[PDB]
Design a protein around this nucleic acid. Structure first.
Ligand SMILES: [K+]
Ligand SMILES: [Mg+2]
Ligand SMILES: [Mg+2]
Ligand SMILES: [Mg+2]
Ligand SMILES: [Mg+2]
Lengths: 247, 290, 95, 50, 51
RNA sequence: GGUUCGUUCCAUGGAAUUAACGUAAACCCUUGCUUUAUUUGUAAAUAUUAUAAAGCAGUUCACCUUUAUAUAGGAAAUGAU
C-alpha cells in the first residue's frame, strides 16, 4: 500500500526543454509521416481541393503555447504537401492528422431584405441625411413629383436642391417615366433634399435593379453618415476653444 | 470538356500505374550486377555505427578545422598540422575522445540519468531527434532559452512530469508531489555546436551538470567537461558522432532494464523524491496514532 | 505549522528541498546595508542594497545580495538568495 | 575580462563535496545525483596545455 | 426584508477586506508592509494558461 | 534589422523568462442591416417614418505589389459594399 521503494521523476515528452513542447511533438509526427509516405504520388496543385487550414492564432490557443510564425510556416507546408497525396492512396493515419488542421469557421450572414412592390406598383424607398428621413413612392408615370404634398418648386426655393432631390432619375435619364410622391420629415433644406436622393434611388432599384452600377458612380447609393458633433465642456463649440491667456 | 476530362483519367490512373510500377520495380531492378554500395547519405540515421574508426571519421570530414587565422591556441593539443590553409585535427585524438564520451553517455544512462542532446543548426534536427530515440533522452534543435536551468522554476513551470519505477513504468500516488516538485535538469548534456550556444554550457557548469561537446579548432575547450575534437560545421561528421553517442545510451538503457528484471536496481531514489517519502511517513504516522 | 504565514519560504522550499522549520535553524546575519540612488527622468530613486550570509555552523556558507526600495523586502531577498547559494567550505579540524 | 569563469571540468569535485554532508546538521546526506557515480572513474582530460 | 449572505473567505468582498486591514493598521506598532503580505498570501488565484 | 496608427508584429542578440497599470480591446452616441413591439407616435397600408430592446457588419471580398520568404502594404467619384 505504501509507495514504491525506488522512484524517479521523468519527463513525459522528449521535448521537455524546448520552447514549445506540445507543438514540436505534433510537428515531429508530421516529419515522421513525411518519411514513410513520401514515395506515394502527388496531385497537381490545381487539382487539390481547397481547404481552410487553421491560422497561427488557432494553434497558439488550442496548444496553449507561443509557436513562432516561422516555425509554424514550415509545419503548415508539410500539411499542404501531405494533402497532395492521392485520396485513394492516402492512408488513414494522414487523413486523421489532416482533419485536426481544418478551420471550421462560418462568417455571420446578414442579407438585406428586398424592397417589395405594392399591388398598385409603388415601391417605398427610405433615405436619410443627417437629421431627416424620406419615403419616396415611385410609380410608372409621366414625371410628376410631389414632396410632402407640394411641388418640387413650391417646396425647394433653391434649384440646387431640386436637381439633387431627383438626381437619381436625372443621371439615369428617367425623369419622364416615373412619378414620385415623397414625404419628408425633420432636418433642413439640404438635409431633406439629399435625403430624397437616396430614397428615390433605393425605390428606383426596386423597379430596375440593373441601374445600381450607374447610381453608384452618380453618388445616389451612398448614405452620408456625417453628423453634427456635440458640444464639449471647456469648448465654445464642438471644437472651438475659448481664449488662451499665456500670462 | 475534353480538356479537363483528361485530368480525370490521369488522376484516376495513378493508383493503377503506381501499383503496376511498384511490382515491375521488384522484377528487373537488380539483374545486371551487384552494386557495392559502401556509402548512403542517410546511413548514420537508419543504422548508426556502434563505434567510429579512423576511416569513418575521415570520410565524414571530421578532421577539417577552421582557417589557421581563426583558431584558439588553447586547443593546439588536438591539431595534427596545417593543410589547405586550415588546421587538421588528429584522427586519433578524435577517436579516443569519442570513445570516452560514449562510455560517459552509456553509464549515465545505466544509472537512470536524464540525457539531453542539443544541436541547434539548420540541418541538425533529424540527427538529434534520432539520437534521443535510441538513448531515450530529450532533444533540442532550437535556440536554448536562457535560464531554463538556473531559472527552471519559471520557464519549465507548466510542463508535465511523471514518476516511474525501476522498469520505467509509471507509479500511482505521487499526484501531490508532481505539483510542488520543481522542474528537472539534464544529468548530462551533449552539445553538437558548443561554439554557438555558450549560455547553455554555462548554466551546466554553474549548476554542476556534466557536458559533452564537439570542440572545433576555434572553440574554447574549457566550455565542456568532455571534449570531442572534430569538425562541427560538417553535417556528416555530426551525424556520425550523434549515432555513436546515441547507440551508447541505447546499450546503457538495455543493461539497466535487463538488470531490473533480475531485481537489481542500478540507482537509488533521488534526494527530491526521497524527502517526499519521509514526509509521507510523518503524515501517515498521525493516521496510525489518531 | 504556521512558521511561514507570508509565503516567502515556499519558493525556496523547492530549490534546496528542506522543511521550513529547518530553514529557521540557519544562522543568518545582515552584513552590508547601502543606500544607493539612481537618477532617472522622474527624480532620484533610492534603493537599499543588502548582503546577507547564511550558514548552518557546520561547514556551509552562502552569500546573497539584493536591493529594493523597501528595506524589509531587500533583506528577505538576500536571505532566500543566500540560503540557496550555500556551498561547503573546507575547514581544518572543523576549526 | 570579457570571459567568464567556466568550471565545467570540476562538476564532479564540486558535486562530490556538496553531497558528502547534509546542510541540516544531524541528518544523513541525501542520495547524490544519478550521474555522480556514472563518471566516478572517468576523469576529464587535461586541457589548455601547449 | 433581509438577505444576509454568509461569506466563507473575507477576500471575496472589498468592503470586508478594507475594514479588516484597517483595524490591523490602527495599532501604533502595526507593521504596514507585513500586514499586506499576509493578506495577499491568503488570496489564492486559480491556475491559468496565460496563452 | 524590418514593419506598424502603436514596445503592434516578425526575425535576431555570449541571457533572458514573466506580472500589474496605462495602451489596446470593450463600452455609450452615431451609421447600414435582421428580428421584435405599434401607443400617447404613423395619410393609407400587405409596414415604409418614428420609438428602442437584442444581434450582425470592414478593409471583409476582389484587384495590384511584396524584404530575410518570416511579419505585409498600396490604390480613395467611375471593383463589390
Ligand atoms: K426602425
Ligand atoms: Mg452648430
Ligand atoms: Mg566551427
Ligand atoms: Mg526579447
Ligand atoms: Mg482605450
Amino acid at each position: 500500500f505504501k509507495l514504491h521503494p525506488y522512484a524517479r521523476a521523468v519527463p513525459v515528452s522528449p521535448s521537455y526543454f524546448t520552447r514549445t513542447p506540445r507543438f514540436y511533438d505534433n510537428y515531429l509526427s508530421l516529419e515522421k509521416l513525411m518519411e514513410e509516405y513520401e514515395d506515394l504520388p502527388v496531385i497537381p496543385a490545381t487539382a487539390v481541393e481547397r481547404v481552410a487550414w487553421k491560422t497561427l492564432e488557432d494553434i497558439r490557443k488550442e496548444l496553449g503555447e507561443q509557436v513562432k510564425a516561422s516555425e509554424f510556416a514550415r509545419c503548415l507546408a508539410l500539411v499542404k504537401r501531405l494533402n497532395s497525396i492521392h485520396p485513394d492512396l492516402k492512408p488513414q493515419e494522414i487523413k486523421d492528422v489532416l482533419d485536426s488542421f481544418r478551420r471550421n469557421v462560418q462568417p455571420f450572414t446578414n442579407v438585406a431584405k428586398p424592397i417589395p412592390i405594392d399591388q398598385f406598383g409603388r415601391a417605398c424607398g427610405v433615405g436619410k441625411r443627417k437629421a431627416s428621413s424620406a419615403r419616396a413612392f415611385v410609380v410608372e408615370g409621366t414625371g410628376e413629383v410631389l414632396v410632402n404634398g407640394k411641388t418640387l418648386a413650391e417646396y425647394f426655393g433653391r434649384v440646387h436642391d431640386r436637381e439633387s432631390a431627383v438626381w437619381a432619375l436625372r443621371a439615369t435619364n428617367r425623369i419622364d417615366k416615373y412619378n414620385v410622391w415623397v414625404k419628408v420629415e425633420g432636418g433642413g433644406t439640404t438635409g431633406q433634399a439629399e435625403a430624397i436622393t437616396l430614397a428615390i434611388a433605393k425605390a428606383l432599384l426596386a423597379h430596375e435593379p440593373a441601374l445600381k452600377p450607374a447610381l453608384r458612380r452618380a453618388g445616389c447609393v451612398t448614405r452620408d453618415p456625417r453628423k453634427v458633433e456635440r458640444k464639449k465642456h471647456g469648448h465654445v463649440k464642438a471644437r472651438k476653444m475659448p481664449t488662451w491667456v499665456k500670462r | 470538356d475534353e480538356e479537363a476530362l483528361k485530368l480525370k483519367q490521369q488522376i484516376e490512373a495513378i493508383p493503377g500505374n503506381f501499383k503496376l510500377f511498384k511490382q515491375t520495380k521488384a522484377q528487373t531492378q537488380k539483374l545486371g550486377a551487384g552494386v557495392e554500395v559502401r556509402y548512403i547519405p542517410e546511413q548514420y540515421l537508419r543504422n548508426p555505427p556502434s563505434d567510429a574508426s579512423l576511416e569513418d571519421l575521415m570520410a565524414a570530414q571530421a578532421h577539417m578545422g577552421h582557417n589557421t587565422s581563426l583558431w584558439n591556441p588553447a586547443n593546439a593539443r588536438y591539431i595534427y598540422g596545417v593543410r589547405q590553409g586550415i588546421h587538421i585535427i588528429s584522427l586519433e585524438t578524435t577517436a579516443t575522445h569519442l570513445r570516452r564520451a560514449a562510455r560517459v553517455v552509456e553509464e549515465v544512462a545505466y544509472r537512470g540519468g536524464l540525457i539531453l542532446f542539443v544541436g541547434t543548426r539548420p540541418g541538425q534536427r533529424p540527427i538529434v531527434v534520432r539520437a534521443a530515440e535510441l538513448a531515450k533522452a530529450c532533444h533540442l534543435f532550437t535556440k536554448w532559452r536562457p535560464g531554463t536551468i538556473t531559472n527552471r522554476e519559471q520557464l519549465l513551470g507548466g510542463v508535465p512530469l511523471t514518476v516511474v519505477d525501476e522498469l520505467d513504468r509509471p507509479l500511482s500516488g505521487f499526484e501531490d508531489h508532481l505539483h510542488d516538485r520543481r522542474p528537472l535538469a539534464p544529468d548530462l548534456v551533449v552539445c553538437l555546436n558548443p561554439k554557438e550556444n555558450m549560455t547553455l554550457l554555462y548554466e551546466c557548469s554553474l549548476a554542476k551538470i556534466p557536458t559533452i561537446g564537439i570542440i572545433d579548432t576555434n572553440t574554447n575547450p574549457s566550455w565542456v567537461t568532455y571534449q570531442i575534437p572534430a569538425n562541427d560545421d560538417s553535417l556528416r561528421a555530426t551525424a556520425l558522432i550523434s549515432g555513436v553517442l546515441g547507440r551508447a545510451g541505447e546499450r546503457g538503457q538495455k543493461r539497466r532494464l535487463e538488470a531490473a528484471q533480475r531485481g537489481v536496481v542500478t540507482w537509488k531514489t533521488p534526494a527530491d523524491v526521497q524527502g517526499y517519502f519521509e514526509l509521507a511517513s510523518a503524515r501517515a504516522a498521525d493516521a496510525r496514532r489518531r | 505549522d504556521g512558521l511561514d504565514d507570508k509565503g516567502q519560504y515556499q519558493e525556496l522550499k523547492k530549490r534546496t528541498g528542506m522543511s521550513v522549520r529547518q530553514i529557521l535553524q540557519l544562522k543568518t546575519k545582515k552584513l552590508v546595508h547601502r543606500r544607493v540612488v539612481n537618477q532617472t527622468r522622474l527624480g532620484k530613486i533610492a534603493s537599499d542594497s543588502v548582503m546577507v550570509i547564511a550558514g548552518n555552523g557546520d561547514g556551509w556558507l552562502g552569500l546573497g545580495m539584493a536591493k529594493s526600495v523597501e528595506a524589509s523586502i531587500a533583506v528577505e531577498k538576500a536571505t532566500l538568495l543566500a540560503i540557496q547559494n550555500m556551498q561547503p567550505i573546507p575547514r581544518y579540524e572543523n576549526r | 575580462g570579457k570571459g567568464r569563469i567556466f568550471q565545467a571540468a570540476k562538476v564532479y569535485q564540486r558535486a562530490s563535496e556538496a553531497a558528502a554532508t547534509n546542510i541540516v546538521s544531524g541528518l544523513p546526506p541525501r542520495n547524490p545525483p544519478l550521474w555522480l557515480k556514472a563518471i566516478e572513474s572517468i576523469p576529464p582530460a587535461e586541457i589548455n596545455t601547449r | 426584508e433581509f438577505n444576509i449572505v454568509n461569506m466563507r473567505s473575507f477576500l471575496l468582498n472589498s468592503d470586508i477586506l478594507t475594514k479588516i486591514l484597517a483595524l490591523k493598521l490602527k495599532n501604533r506598532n502595526a507593521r504596514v508592509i507585513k500586514i499586506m503580505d499576509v493578506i495577499l498570501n491568503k488570496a489564492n488565484l486559480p491556475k491559468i494558461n496565460r496563452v
